[PDB]
Amino acid sequence: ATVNQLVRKPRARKVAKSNVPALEACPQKRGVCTRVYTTTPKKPNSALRKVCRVRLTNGFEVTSYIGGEGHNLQEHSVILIRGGRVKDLPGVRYHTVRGALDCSGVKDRKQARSKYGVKRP
Amino acid sequence: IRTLQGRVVSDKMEKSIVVAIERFVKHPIYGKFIKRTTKLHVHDENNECGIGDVVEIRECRPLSKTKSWTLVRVVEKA
Amino acid sequence: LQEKLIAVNRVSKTVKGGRIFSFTALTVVGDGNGRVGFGYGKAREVPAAIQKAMEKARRNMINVALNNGTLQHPVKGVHTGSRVFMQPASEGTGIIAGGAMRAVLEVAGVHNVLAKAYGSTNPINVVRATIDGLENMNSPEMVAAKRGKSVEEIL
Amino acid sequence: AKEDNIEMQGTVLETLPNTMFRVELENGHVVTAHISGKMRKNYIRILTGDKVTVELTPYDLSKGRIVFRS
Amino acid sequence: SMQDPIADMLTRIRNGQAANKAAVTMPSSKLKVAIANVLKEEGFIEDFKVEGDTKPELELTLKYFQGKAVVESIQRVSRPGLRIYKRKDELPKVMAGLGIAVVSTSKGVMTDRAARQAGLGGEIICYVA
Amino acid sequence: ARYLGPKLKLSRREGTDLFLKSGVRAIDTKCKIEQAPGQHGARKPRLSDYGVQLREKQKVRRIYGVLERQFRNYYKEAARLKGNTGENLLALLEGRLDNVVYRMGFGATRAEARQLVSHKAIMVNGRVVNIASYQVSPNDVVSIREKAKKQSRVKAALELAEQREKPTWLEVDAGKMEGTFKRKPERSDLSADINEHLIVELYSK
RNA sequence: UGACGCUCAGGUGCGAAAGCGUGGGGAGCAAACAGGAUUAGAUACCCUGGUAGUCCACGCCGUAAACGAUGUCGACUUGGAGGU
RNA sequence: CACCGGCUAACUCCGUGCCAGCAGCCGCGGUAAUACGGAGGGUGCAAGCGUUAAUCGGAAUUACUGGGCGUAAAGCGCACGCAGGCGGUUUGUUAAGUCAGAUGUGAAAUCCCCGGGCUCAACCUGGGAACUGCAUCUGAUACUGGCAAGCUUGAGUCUCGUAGAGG
RNA sequence: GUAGGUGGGGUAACGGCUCACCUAGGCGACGAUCCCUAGCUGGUCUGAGAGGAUGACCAGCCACACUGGAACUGAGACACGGUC
Ligand SMILES: NC(=O)OC[C@@H](O)C[C@H](NC(=O)[C@H]1NCCC[C@H]1O)C(=O)N[C@@H](Cc1c[nH]cn1)C(=O)N[C@H](C(=O)O)[C@H](O)c1c[nH]c(Cl)n1
Ligand SMILES: [K+]
Ligand SMILES: [K+]
Ligand SMILES: [K+]
Ligand SMILES: [K+]
Ligand SMILES: [K+]
Ligand SMILES: [K+]
Ligand SMILES: [K+]
Ligand SMILES: [K+]
Ligand SMILES: [K+]
Ligand SMILES: [K+]
Ligand SMILES: [K+]
Ligand SMILES: [Mg+2]
Ligand SMILES: [Mg+2]
Ligand SMILES: [Mg+2]
Ligand SMILES: [Mg+2]
Ligand SMILES: [Mg+2]
Ligand SMILES: [Mg+2]
Ligand SMILES: [Mg+2]
Ligand SMILES: [Mg+2]
Ligand SMILES: [Mg+2]
Ligand SMILES: [Mg+2]
Ligand SMILES: [Mg+2]
Ligand SMILES: [Mg+2]
Ligand SMILES: [Mg+2]
Ligand SMILES: [Mg+2]
Ligand SMILES: [Mg+2]
Ligand SMILES: [Mg+2]
Ligand SMILES: [Mg+2]
Ligand SMILES: [Mg+2]
Ligand SMILES: [Mg+2]
Ligand SMILES: [Mg+2]
Ligand SMILES: [Mg+2]
Ligand SMILES: [Mg+2]
Ligand SMILES: [Mg+2]
Ligand SMILES: [Mg+2]
Ligand SMILES: [Mg+2]
């Protein structure tokens, strides 16, 4: 681009969107579980991964990953979601926070307890 | 004392002219010297100035909605 | 001489049987007082690849005019897609360089430098660009020589 | 230490893309099952009509893993 | 069309040095001669001469040192599409003051060093190194 | 806010005597200094350039007894101060009262010196200072309080410091139990084992 | 003659073939289509026919791998062999 | 408190067997998993430590500094041409751009420097520096612009002739 | 009332501020008008710098006071804890 072309039309910066739009620049959002189910991951991996469809306070219906071994969530459970993509699940851009609101901590966890909402034994 | 020099671009108003004051400013980002134009409505009591004339003007009190500049002299006739 | 391994890469050629794997080795060597050279060795094993690189590096050493453990002036080096920039620094700055450039500058005996690597940061091409940078650098004395002046008149 | 599965027999009612299957189980519920990794690795083919063991989860009774074909 | 005679002169020096030419010749001008005088006295060229009257022509005798060309680099800085001016305090040092910048001041064309000591800024014509 | 764990584990990980014991007894007699701590410590893996930088930083921190936040602040100050950042960093650390108290030979270790300071037993220019990180300046007189002059550990610590290489930038009096921080130590006065430029590079990441 | 120049957003025009409108023309060729084959099928390739179209006038369309996949103008920088 | 496959400082055993699960990316898990879960050991931080969100950085990945366009994304199908950008050479003149000096202003705080005060530090504070700017006045006149007069090398006109599936 | 003029009125004060009459202007690709978003600044965060992002606290300026109008009193308001 010539100097004179930049004067006529400056360098336009790219408008980089959020990877986590349903949070609306909040560190967490509360929501109600509309469905709680399992989903098979993308090709290279295999599992039945625990997920829930969550209706957030701001009205965004999103899918959230339920980390850790075992969970107590059902339809109409009230949960807190954070940001966090799960690579091998299409569309899963949010994690459920364990040990917050209706979502229990993981049973018998001893390492990374703070990530799974588990009190010190 | 304080005057601008510019060129008459209209004379169609009674006792009033539009005067274009050309400025040569370095562009803030790119550094190229650009031509910028300030247009001023100017009071011309006698209706002496025609289009194309170069005129010296000075700032005065408000004379109309848009006029706050008055003719000092015609520098060059067109 | 100081010697430094930069990168070891496993490369592969397909044959009718399958794939013949082999190892490459980018090394640099220098006295830590202006002299530096790089070598690139290939072998079926890593230790042989290194030793080949070291031997090539020892015989392909350039000269650089350093100004008390730093550069004479800002220098730009290019090779392939690698574009490097280096400039002199004050004492105690340290080597502010990235990866391959640091190895070169370390063994060459540049203690204080500010560097950046633009474009491709492929170690092979970065090392060349760096050494291309340092060889094209000019002392006051050689600038004075070509211009037919004293050091005082130039500076 | 992991939670336990529910094994159940069923017939493959149709094959789907990429080793996915509808399987009508003993209890009469149709689950969308997928092939196990061990069966994929060892190349055990599954077809419409084949009798399959299906590991189900209590977290989802519309999904399963085919672990055996008889 | 021809819109930068100075860039042209610099290109002739640059191209001439790359082709190991003994001399380069071009249409003369007062400004070209002024720059030529700076190049000569700093010792980037050997000599210069103007010949002609109606259509004068500037010849420059290029220097070589141990085979290699003395003009390592020569860059047009201020140009018609983007003029560059500098105050005395922001005059550029080329190659940490091993090169020169040719500066048009109100006391004539000179090096950035001479412009600093005179205490003048001006238009940055070219870098030479 | 202090490291209260085993000392020789730290020395073993750095692979050098960090002087965290009194030095009445040799470090090899109390631990396997050559061997890194733990199960997989007999192994000596090849350490990365980052790992060399880190282990240099952690060596200096562990000698003086400074946690990361406070050490990072010492670095920022050294970068700010004019002259060589690396030399400035080591000067600041040497300035610390706990260090100065140790180098004069009032505490047997820097941890014993830190306790003396913390327990209001040290005066700088006649005034009680109980801050280990207090920067001592040239011509300051560090002293033991009259209550703390009877402490048997202080008598013992002086005898140990007689064995060690005497700081030229200090001037202690054993009978008085006071010393003058004459000047700031030069880079030459400190030990050559420290490669401070690695710390400068580490923080320049 | 005496700098009258270079480039050019917007603008304006030109712009293969197919195509469109109106009126002519229509040998050969030939989308569609009709029949004959081939084949597992053959909505094709192959065969025999064959309409639009291809041609002309006037108007419209404004696109092509509209390619040197290389914007226009000016200056400078070793050679060799050809063509016109 | 987090972490210990690589990036990235820190490795073993047992359990599990592409399951359960991990994951920022690359990836790990299909029986001897330093990557999952637990344990021992280790590393990093420490009254905090992680996670998430958000901004800049790294990103020369909108490139003024500082990028590209034959084939990677990128030359309008081609021309003419208004606005606009740019303008061969000489003299004089002007002093708009530009340069120099000075004056006024650019609140304090903040940032930075040298000090001072709270036991230290954060913090508070004295003085300075800085506020890269704007305006005015006085100068400079090489370069760019204006104006005036030129010049012929750019660009055109004329004379004569030539080739061509140009229309 | 749009732009200017003239005259009258109006204001603490200049002024289409308002009115009558006259003239037909005024603004706009140097982006008017329209739509969306937004209090501005000193600064703050980031960055080697140039930039980018930002404007919470502190300080300067502005605007608002349930919503929409309006004035009154007063040196000052079209008035957070005044009036209609
Ligand atoms: N029909 C079906 O579903 O499958 C059968 C198909 O695979 C036959 C095969 N066809 C071809 O290659 C085509 N090539 C293009 C021209 C037409 C045709 O020929 C073929 O082998 N042909 C023979 C002739 C033939 C047709 N049916 C039975 N036999 C043939 O001579 N093919 C030639 C070749 O393969 O080089 C060539 O294509 C050709 C010459 N003349 C004709 Cl006709 N075809
Ligand atoms: K996998
Ligand atoms: K420093
Ligand atoms: K034009
Ligand atoms: K026909
Ligand atoms: K650029
Ligand atoms: K001039
Ligand atoms: K009005
Ligand atoms: K009026
Ligand atoms: K700002
Ligand atoms: K309101
Ligand atoms: K009053
Ligand atoms: Mg106004
Ligand atoms: Mg703390
Ligand atoms: Mg053109
Ligand atoms: Mg046609
Ligand atoms: Mg027709
Ligand atoms: Mg036919
Ligand atoms: Mg046919
Ligand atoms: Mg196209
Ligand atoms: Mg194209
Ligand atoms: Mg195992
Ligand atoms: Mg950037
Ligand atoms: Mg690019
Ligand atoms: Mg392609
Ligand atoms: Mg392409
Ligand atoms: Mg083209
Ligand atoms: Mg000119
Ligand atoms: Mg001026
Ligand atoms: Mg201020
Ligand atoms: Mg002139
Ligand atoms: Mg708002
Ligand atoms: Mg940057
Ligand atoms: Mg009043
Ligand atoms: Mg108000
Ligand atoms: Mg009130
Ligand atoms: Mg109230």
PDB file of all heavy atoms in Angstrom, chain G residues 20-23 53-54 56-57, ligand 17:
ATOM      1  P     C G  20     -31.635 -17.535 -25.973  1.00  0.00           P
ATOM      2  OP1   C G  20     -32.824 -18.366 -25.631  1.00  0.00           O
ATOM      3  OP2   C G  20     -31.182 -17.492 -27.393  1.00  0.00           O
ATOM      4  O5'   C G  20     -31.945 -16.026 -25.576  1.00  0.00           O
ATOM      5  C5'   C G  20     -32.499 -15.740 -24.275  1.00  0.00           C
ATOM      6  C4'   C G  20     -32.751 -14.262 -24.182  1.00  0.00           C
ATOM      7  O4'   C G  20     -31.500 -13.537 -24.262  1.00  0.00           O
ATOM      8  C3'   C G  20     -33.579 -13.654 -25.316  1.00  0.00           C
ATOM      9  O3'   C G  20     -34.950 -13.981 -25.174  1.00  0.00           O
ATOM     10  C2'   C G  20     -33.244 -12.178 -25.124  1.00  0.00           C
ATOM     11  O2'   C G  20     -33.913 -11.608 -24.021  1.00  0.00           O
ATOM     12  C1'   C G  20     -31.737 -12.263 -24.830  1.00  0.00           C
ATOM     13  N1    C G  20     -30.902 -12.090 -26.057  1.00  0.00           N
ATOM     14  C2    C G  20     -30.777 -10.798 -26.588  1.00  0.00           C
ATOM     15  O2    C G  20     -31.350  -9.854 -26.023  1.00  0.00           O
ATOM     16  N3    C G  20     -30.039 -10.611 -27.712  1.00  0.00           N
ATOM     17  C4    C G  20     -29.434 -11.644 -28.311  1.00  0.00           C
ATOM     18  N4    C G  20     -28.720 -11.394 -29.401  1.00  0.00           N
ATOM     19  C5    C G  20     -29.542 -12.966 -27.788  1.00  0.00           C
ATOM     20  C6    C G  20     -30.285 -13.146 -26.681  1.00  0.00           C
ATOM     21  P     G G  21     -35.900 -14.164 -26.456  1.00  0.00           P
ATOM     22  OP1   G G  21     -37.239 -14.641 -26.007  1.00  0.00           O
ATOM     23  OP2   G G  21     -35.220 -14.905 -27.555  1.00  0.00           O
ATOM     24  O5'   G G  21     -36.016 -12.646 -26.939  1.00  0.00           O
ATOM     25  C5'   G G  21     -36.711 -11.692 -26.097  1.00  0.00           C
ATOM     26  C4'   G G  21     -36.827 -10.372 -26.818  1.00  0.00           C
ATOM     27  O4'   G G  21     -35.532  -9.734 -26.880  1.00  0.00           O
ATOM     28  C3'   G G  21     -37.276 -10.425 -28.278  1.00  0.00           C
ATOM     29  O3'   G G  21     -38.685 -10.577 -28.370  1.00  0.00           O
ATOM     30  C2'   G G  21     -36.782  -9.071 -28.782  1.00  0.00           C
ATOM     31  O2'   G G  21     -37.650  -8.011 -28.443  1.00  0.00           O
ATOM     32  C1'   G G  21     -35.449  -8.939 -28.045  1.00  0.00           C
ATOM     33  N9    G G  21     -34.295  -9.364 -28.831  1.00  0.00           N
ATOM     34  C8    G G  21     -33.619 -10.559 -28.759  1.00  0.00           C
ATOM     35  N7    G G  21     -32.599 -10.628 -29.578  1.00  0.00           N
ATOM     36  C5    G G  21     -32.599  -9.403 -30.228  1.00  0.00           C
ATOM     37  C6    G G  21     -31.727  -8.896 -31.227  1.00  0.00           C
ATOM     38  O6    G G  21     -30.751  -9.451 -31.747  1.00  0.00           O
ATOM     39  N1    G G  21     -32.086  -7.602 -31.615  1.00  0.00           N
ATOM     40  C2    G G  21     -33.145  -6.886 -31.106  1.00  0.00           C
ATOM     41  N2    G G  21     -33.343  -5.654 -31.596  1.00  0.00           N
ATOM     42  N3    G G  21     -33.964  -7.359 -30.167  1.00  0.00           N
ATOM     43  C4    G G  21     -33.638  -8.617 -29.778  1.00  0.00           C
ATOM     44  P     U G  22     -39.358 -11.366 -29.596  1.00  0.00           P
ATOM     45  OP1   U G  22     -40.835 -11.444 -29.410  1.00  0.00           O
ATOM     46  OP2   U G  22     -38.614 -12.629 -29.877  1.00  0.00           O
ATOM     47  O5'   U G  22     -39.038 -10.339 -30.773  1.00  0.00           O
ATOM     48  C5'   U G  22     -39.788  -9.104 -30.855  1.00  0.00           C
ATOM     49  C4'   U G  22     -39.309  -8.307 -32.042  1.00  0.00           C
ATOM     50  O4'   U G  22     -37.932  -7.895 -31.848  1.00  0.00           O
ATOM     51  C3'   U G  22     -39.269  -9.044 -33.381  1.00  0.00           C
ATOM     52  O3'   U G  22     -40.559  -9.168 -33.960  1.00  0.00           O
ATOM     53  C2'   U G  22     -38.329  -8.137 -34.174  1.00  0.00           C
ATOM     54  O2'   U G  22     -38.954  -6.953 -34.624  1.00  0.00           O
ATOM     55  C1'   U G  22     -37.285  -7.803 -33.107  1.00  0.00           C
ATOM     56  N1    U G  22     -36.114  -8.727 -33.140  1.00  0.00           N
ATOM     57  C2    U G  22     -35.053  -8.389 -33.974  1.00  0.00           C
ATOM     58  O2    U G  22     -35.041  -7.378 -34.667  1.00  0.00           O
ATOM     59  N3    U G  22     -33.998  -9.274 -33.961  1.00  0.00           N
ATOM     60  C4    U G  22     -33.899 -10.447 -33.233  1.00  0.00           C
ATOM     61  O4    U G  22     -32.884 -11.141 -33.326  1.00  0.00           O
ATOM     62  C5    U G  22     -35.035 -10.731 -32.403  1.00  0.00           C
ATOM     63  C6    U G  22     -36.084  -9.891 -32.399  1.00  0.00           C
ATOM     64  P     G G  23     -40.930 -10.428 -34.889  1.00  0.00           P
ATOM     65  OP1   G G  23     -42.355 -10.330 -35.317  1.00  0.00           O
ATOM     66  OP2   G G  23     -40.467 -11.697 -34.255  1.00  0.00           O
ATOM     67  O5'   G G  23     -39.998 -10.131 -36.153  1.00  0.00           O
ATOM     68  C5'   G G  23     -40.353  -9.028 -37.018  1.00  0.00           C
ATOM     69  C4'   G G  23     -39.259  -8.790 -38.028  1.00  0.00           C
ATOM     70  O4'   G G  23     -37.997  -8.571 -37.358  1.00  0.00           O
ATOM     71  C3'   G G  23     -38.941  -9.931 -38.988  1.00  0.00           C
ATOM     72  O3'   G G  23     -39.917 -10.055 -40.014  1.00  0.00           O
ATOM     73  C2'   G G  23     -37.579  -9.469 -39.510  1.00  0.00           C
ATOM     74  O2'   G G  23     -37.686  -8.491 -40.524  1.00  0.00           O
ATOM     75  C1'   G G  23     -36.944  -8.886 -38.246  1.00  0.00           C
ATOM     76  N9    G G  23     -36.022  -9.813 -37.599  1.00  0.00           N
ATOM     77  C8    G G  23     -36.288 -10.707 -36.589  1.00  0.00           C
ATOM     78  N7    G G  23     -35.247 -11.425 -36.244  1.00  0.00           N
ATOM     79  C5    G G  23     -34.237 -10.994 -37.096  1.00  0.00           C
ATOM     80  C6    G G  23     -32.885 -11.412 -37.203  1.00  0.00           C
ATOM     81  O6    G G  23     -32.295 -12.277 -36.538  1.00  0.00           O
ATOM     82  N1    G G  23     -32.204 -10.703 -38.199  1.00  0.00           N
ATOM     83  C2    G G  23     -32.760  -9.734 -39.006  1.00  0.00           C
ATOM     84  N2    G G  23     -31.958  -9.150 -39.909  1.00  0.00           N
ATOM     85  N3    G G  23     -34.028  -9.337 -38.904  1.00  0.00           N
ATOM     86  C4    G G  23     -34.705 -10.009 -37.940  1.00  0.00           C
ATOM     87  P     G G  53     -32.615 -19.088 -33.237  1.00  0.00           P
ATOM     88  OP1   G G  53     -33.047 -17.719 -32.839  1.00  0.00           O
ATOM     89  OP2   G G  53     -32.842 -19.515 -34.647  1.00  0.00           O
ATOM     90  O5'   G G  53     -31.056 -19.206 -32.919  1.00  0.00           O
ATOM     91  C5'   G G  53     -30.579 -18.966 -31.580  1.00  0.00           C
ATOM     92  C4'   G G  53     -29.228 -19.619 -31.411  1.00  0.00           C
ATOM     93  O4'   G G  53     -29.359 -21.044 -31.636  1.00  0.00           O
ATOM     94  C3'   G G  53     -28.133 -19.184 -32.388  1.00  0.00           C
ATOM     95  O3'   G G  53     -27.466 -18.014 -31.937  1.00  0.00           O
ATOM     96  C2'   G G  53     -27.210 -20.404 -32.381  1.00  0.00           C
ATOM     97  O2'   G G  53     -26.318 -20.428 -31.289  1.00  0.00           O
ATOM     98  C1'   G G  53     -28.215 -21.549 -32.286  1.00  0.00           C
ATOM     99  N9    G G  53     -28.602 -22.095 -33.583  1.00  0.00           N
ATOM    100  C8    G G  53     -29.704 -21.783 -34.338  1.00  0.00           C
ATOM    101  N7    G G  53     -29.779 -22.455 -35.460  1.00  0.00           N
ATOM    102  C5    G G  53     -28.656 -23.270 -35.440  1.00  0.00           C
ATOM    103  C6    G G  53     -28.198 -24.215 -36.392  1.00  0.00           C
ATOM    104  O6    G G  53     -28.723 -24.523 -37.473  1.00  0.00           O
ATOM    105  N1    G G  53     -26.999 -24.814 -35.987  1.00  0.00           N
ATOM    106  C2    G G  53     -26.328 -24.536 -34.817  1.00  0.00           C
ATOM    107  N2    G G  53     -25.194 -25.212 -34.581  1.00  0.00           N
ATOM    108  N3    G G  53     -26.762 -23.652 -33.915  1.00  0.00           N
ATOM    109  C4    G G  53     -27.919 -23.052 -34.294  1.00  0.00           C
ATOM    110  P     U G  54     -26.888 -16.939 -32.982  1.00  0.00           P
ATOM    111  OP1   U G  54     -26.186 -15.836 -32.260  1.00  0.00           O
ATOM    112  OP2   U G  54     -27.966 -16.591 -33.952  1.00  0.00           O
ATOM    113  O5'   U G  54     -25.760 -17.784 -33.734  1.00  0.00           O
ATOM    114  C5'   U G  54     -24.509 -18.064 -33.048  1.00  0.00           C
ATOM    115  C4'   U G  54     -23.668 -18.989 -33.895  1.00  0.00           C
ATOM    116  O4'   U G  54     -24.384 -20.225 -34.128  1.00  0.00           O
ATOM    117  C3'   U G  54     -23.310 -18.490 -35.298  1.00  0.00           C
ATOM    118  O3'   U G  54     -22.156 -17.661 -35.250  1.00  0.00           O
ATOM    119  C2'   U G  54     -23.014 -19.802 -36.024  1.00  0.00           C
ATOM    120  O2'   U G  54     -21.713 -20.287 -35.751  1.00  0.00           O
ATOM    121  C1'   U G  54     -24.044 -20.743 -35.396  1.00  0.00           C
ATOM    122  N1    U G  54     -25.266 -20.871 -36.218  1.00  0.00           N
ATOM    123  C2    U G  54     -25.299 -21.907 -37.137  1.00  0.00           C
ATOM    124  O2    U G  54     -24.382 -22.706 -37.274  1.00  0.00           O
ATOM    125  N3    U G  54     -26.445 -21.980 -37.887  1.00  0.00           N
ATOM    126  C4    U G  54     -27.541 -21.143 -37.816  1.00  0.00           C
ATOM    127  O4    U G  54     -28.502 -21.342 -38.557  1.00  0.00           O
ATOM    128  C5    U G  54     -27.431 -20.092 -36.849  1.00  0.00           C
ATOM    129  C6    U G  54     -26.315 -19.985 -36.110  1.00  0.00           C
ATOM    130  P     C G  56     -22.347 -12.251 -39.014  1.00  0.00           P
ATOM    131  OP1   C G  56     -21.111 -11.489 -39.357  1.00  0.00           O
ATOM    132  OP2   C G  56     -22.707 -12.407 -37.575  1.00  0.00           O
ATOM    133  O5'   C G  56     -23.600 -11.618 -39.768  1.00  0.00           O
ATOM    134  C5'   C G  56     -23.466 -11.263 -41.159  1.00  0.00           C
ATOM    135  C4'   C G  56     -24.721 -10.564 -41.616  1.00  0.00           C
ATOM    136  O4'   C G  56     -25.844 -11.476 -41.577  1.00  0.00           O
ATOM    137  C3'   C G  56     -25.187  -9.384 -40.762  1.00  0.00           C
ATOM    138  O3'   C G  56     -24.421  -8.223 -41.040  1.00  0.00           O
ATOM    139  C2'   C G  56     -26.649  -9.279 -41.191  1.00  0.00           C
ATOM    140  O2'   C G  56     -26.803  -8.687 -42.463  1.00  0.00           O
ATOM    141  C1'   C G  56     -27.028 -10.761 -41.276  1.00  0.00           C
ATOM    142  N1    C G  56     -27.631 -11.294 -40.013  1.00  0.00           N
ATOM    143  C2    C G  56     -28.992 -11.057 -39.781  1.00  0.00           C
ATOM    144  O2    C G  56     -29.640 -10.406 -40.615  1.00  0.00           O
ATOM    145  N3    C G  56     -29.575 -11.572 -38.665  1.00  0.00           N
ATOM    146  C4    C G  56     -28.855 -12.288 -37.787  1.00  0.00           C
ATOM    147  N4    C G  56     -29.470 -12.750 -36.705  1.00  0.00           N
ATOM    148  C5    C G  56     -27.466 -12.519 -37.994  1.00  0.00           C
ATOM    149  C6    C G  56     -26.902 -12.014 -39.104  1.00  0.00           C
ATOM    150  P     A G  57     -24.058  -7.173 -39.880  1.00  0.00           P
ATOM    151  OP1   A G  57     -23.109  -6.147 -40.404  1.00  0.00           O
ATOM    152  OP2   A G  57     -23.716  -7.861 -38.602  1.00  0.00           O
ATOM    153  O5'   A G  57     -25.506  -6.523 -39.725  1.00  0.00           O
ATOM    154  C5'   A G  57     -26.038  -5.744 -40.820  1.00  0.00           C
ATOM    155  C4'   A G  57     -27.373  -5.167 -40.426  1.00  0.00           C
ATOM    156  O4'   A G  57     -28.357  -6.224 -40.333  1.00  0.00           O
ATOM    157  C3'   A G  57     -27.440  -4.485 -39.061  1.00  0.00           C
ATOM    158  O3'   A G  57     -26.889  -3.175 -39.138  1.00  0.00           O
ATOM    159  C2'   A G  57     -28.946  -4.519 -38.800  1.00  0.00           C
ATOM    160  O2'   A G  57     -29.646  -3.496 -39.475  1.00  0.00           O
ATOM    161  C1'   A G  57     -29.318  -5.896 -39.350  1.00  0.00           C
ATOM    162  N9    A G  57     -29.330  -6.945 -38.334  1.00  0.00           N
ATOM    163  C8    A G  57     -28.271  -7.720 -37.923  1.00  0.00           C
ATOM    164  N7    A G  57     -28.585  -8.580 -36.988  1.00  0.00           N
ATOM    165  C5    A G  57     -29.934  -8.360 -36.760  1.00  0.00           C
ATOM    166  C6    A G  57     -30.852  -8.952 -35.868  1.00  0.00           C
ATOM    167  N6    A G  57     -30.535  -9.934 -35.028  1.00  0.00           N
ATOM    168  N1    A G  57     -32.129  -8.487 -35.882  1.00  0.00           N
ATOM    169  C2    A G  57     -32.439  -7.491 -36.726  1.00  0.00           C
ATOM    170  N3    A G  57     -31.660  -6.862 -37.607  1.00  0.00           N
ATOM    171  C4    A G  57     -30.404  -7.345 -37.575  1.00  0.00           C
TER     172        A G  57
HETATM  173 MG    MG J  17     -32.318 -13.102 -32.764  1.00  0.00          MG
END
